[PDB]
Subunit: 306 residues, 4 copies
């Protein structure tokens, strides 16, 4: 297929490496081996400061990392939820993204280590991320941020959590200035062209009807039509924050993401939606593209934070 040559070369090496197989490795070792892959993917830019800490929940201590930019020129805040199919990833795996995002936005970024499946099933991740937004708003003065300039950002499962959070934010009348789901999961899509054509041989390998990651995250089949799991099935998608939805051409989740963005437009929400061509899910195998997308998004957020 017509991919970027660097991405094509990455795919050859990735499949030859044989990281994911339950014949040799246990689940925990697969989690770690993929995390090491993701964490080395983009180079780390320097920032102003980095501070690790834990938010105290009634049953858990939720780790976060606060990024301060090299140059801070606004009082906005970006909540960053990492991807990894609800079962892997962390603050470390998308640390390089947070740094570039912070510098481009010229504002504070807070990355969240939400609890993962199979240990903690849906809806734990959604509520962990939402409680972290509520914590940031409650500590707005301490962080030096404006309460009405809080945005959310997330890749893949992180993009799912951005969409799910926005629905909770609306239920609870918590205002968010913006939402940035990048290559999000928003629905159990079985019918689209992107899903059927690129569900195998483009890093993000998905089995149908219900893939491995979803089975591990959800409790049972009734969760499939839950809007916090599948925000696309929501009856109402109006009065949600201004959105920047980003998709990739050879990503199985491409069409559901573009559908979500159209649904927002139709519901009255001001939305930018663009598709990155010649790239696979999450822009893997192309650190140049991954950087450029993050910088573009930062420029737009910075403009909203003005």
């Amino acid at each position: 297929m017509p991919l970027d040559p660097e991405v094509r070369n990455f795919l050859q090496v990735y499949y030859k490496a044989n990281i994911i197989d339950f014949t040799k490795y246990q689940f925990q070792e697969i989690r770690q081996k993929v995390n090491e892959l993701l964490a080395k993917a983009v180079p780390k830019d320097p920032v102003g400061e980095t501070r690790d800490m834990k938010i105290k929940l009634e049953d858990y201590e939720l780790p976060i990392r606060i990024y301060s930019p090299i140059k801070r020129t606004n009082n906005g805040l970006v909540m960053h939820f990492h991807g990894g199919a609800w079962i892997l990833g962390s603050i470390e795996t998308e640390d390089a993204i947070s740094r570039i995002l912070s510098n481009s936005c010229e504002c504070t970024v807070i990355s969240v280590d939400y609890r993962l499946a199979p240990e903690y099933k849906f809806p734990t991740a959604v509520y962990d991320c939402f409680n972290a937004i509520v914590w940031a708003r409650d500590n707005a003065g301490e962080l030096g941020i404006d309460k009405d300039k809080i945005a959310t950002f997330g890749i893949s499962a992180g993009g799912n959590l951005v969409a799910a959070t926005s629905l909770l934010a609306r239920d609870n009348k918590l205002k968010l200035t913006a939402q940035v789901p990048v290559v999000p999961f928003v629905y159990l899509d079985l019918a689209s062209k992107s899903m059927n054509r690129y569900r195998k041989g483009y890093f993000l390998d998905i089995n149908l009807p219900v893939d491995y990651g979803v089975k591990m995250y959800i409790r049972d089949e009734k969760d499939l039509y839950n809007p916090l799991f599948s925000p696309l099935i929501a009856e109402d998608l109006s009065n949600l924050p201004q959105a920047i939805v980003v998709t990739a051409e050879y990503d199985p989740l491409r069409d559901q993401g573009e559908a979500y963005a159209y649904r927002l437009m139709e519901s009255g929400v001001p939305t930018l939606s663009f598709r990155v061509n010649g790239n696979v899910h999450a822009f893997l195998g192309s650190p140049r593209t991954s950087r450029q997308v993050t910088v573009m998004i930062g420029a737009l957020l910075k403009d909203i934070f003005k």
Copy 2:
């Protein structure tokens, strides 16, 4: 919207007519208004013979029409389930299709008047259609047909029933030689391009996330992931009859139908799948195309009944 000029004209006249208007018509009146439009759509070709009767079921007497072709060259049988979104249509509305199909197949065709929503909800229609197939097989000798040469055919909601009945056929070890879902509904598709682009202004007008016609047919939201309602969601689609799946280019259901066909191919089932270009759902506004598709289908079945 580069449609066939006859189709384009039909849509202009269809929308100006304003048939589906609940302010000035009751549901029963709209059902009849649409039924008259569908019945007059294709002209009736002459056949050998036509026999109306009723199958005796446990709770109902199920009307059927048996068609004998002008020239009967094999002992195949085609069960025909009409379309109409589970809520309208009949043997009369697709009588002209049955006649053309029978002459092209050169074999017997049996059309079924299954019970409709909202009077009878899912899964009544599916079981009425399946029990009609069982009756045909049991009375094979009387009908002069081979038990190994029974095929099923259906348009739209009819195409849904063809997919659903093949799952029951497999469950109950009822041998079918082929299945022909035309422009079928097989899934609650919210994410595909065809659904989002062509769900309004192309005859088949669909609201998201859950359309009016679905709400009338299903009992509750749990039925949305039921394989007999959404066969695309089935975990196993192997060992199903050889399939001829037909879609239309400007049909919101196009992508899910093509997805069904691909899943059959991957599951080992010999499958022909084609998309009819320049046409809307069910080839409406183009009786020529509707005829040609039926003739093609009959020639392929005839070749299977050889």
Copy 3:
């Protein structure tokens, strides 16, 4: 990637096989194409030659097992204007004749690079003129002549229809299957499926084109690229067939759209899960030919 499993397996084998001067490459490919579909029996087969001013053009006349109408189908084989013959598409002619239940005439038009454009187009057109002039001896109706062709054959169907219109020769129908109709560099199908799906094409101008055409000014000639024709109205009723994972898919569909917009009654369908000319799936190839025959039969009824 999401192809019919039989086709997918064929592609794995095809590229591992690694299928020489040009004239010998022609013969190697022709032998492989001729064994591809098994031959159905027909009523009769007759070889003869049409006398043209500079050439004796070989044809084969097929009579069906059962003849039920006086229609005629002219069959022009594919092979990128540079290879192929009556023999390579003999099995298709037989199935087509039986399905149509009418006489089929296959043409051995002259090939490049020996004979460049527009020779092939004129060889096929003169074959149509011959059949129409000798209708009574053939026992066919002059008003029931259809054309049929796959790939480069599909190109020739489109091109001969333009000449048919220019010269006021009535054709009842035209059936370009997976045709070439334009130098398409911009479509999705072309850019996505031009390597790895049997029909491997280089951009901007492929090897097969370079051999067929005389110079670059032929690229906008309507007899080579019928899609660039100013007027596509008053052409015969069309059955255009394409394949989903074929680089020529979009141009063929475009041709069909242009006909519909020009007032020509058109059926256009795309065969899903298949590559150019339905290679790797003899079942599909047979079924498409059967479907086409049933439609032609209906037009001849």
Copy 4:
């Protein structure tokens, strides 16, 4: 179709207006009618400074406008070629874009008034744009810009001129750091889906096989396969500058632009290529989107500079 609601509304107003009607209006009137529509499409952001002048060519004096950003943080230069199907448009019609681009890039922007058809046929526009680039390079010290940091930018016919001038730049060993064709015309595309589906009713109305705008710009049919007119037909697309190609989903030119971008990737040119969804050609009817795209472009160029 599932357009942005604001864009759908713009199309309703646009077709009710009936601007392009050769029964009622002469060509010059239509030119100025469309120029007014393009000029008022996006609001003008304030910049640091604006200067008009003329480059002195052999046979002509080429008007240009120099934009200085509110904040100037690098010594890059972006040459901006306007769109308008080779027959209309000006520095004025795309002035609002130049302003947003200059601010976002935080560098100098120069808009060029190249000569238009039918008065001057192909390849005049291509050479006017190329000579402007050469002038800017020669006067790099006067302008306070680095010779190694010259980029080109263009919309529609402007995008055509960006691709064409990059081929001339390669021929003449003139170095450009980047090229940014937005919704470019790069080929006589008759086969693609986008062309056949969206050539009527989405602002950019195109007739097939050869559109009005092409007939006016081109001398004869032989130019159709000229790489300076159709860069997609170029035998070689390697050693061209780093590219940012931008397309719109409901744009008849969408597929050819994406094809140009892929051809660049295959040829070893580092490229970013994205498609703006729910939008028509040039993001008309959505000034918010048009602004956001230009801001993103500027952020990327700034990062290169």
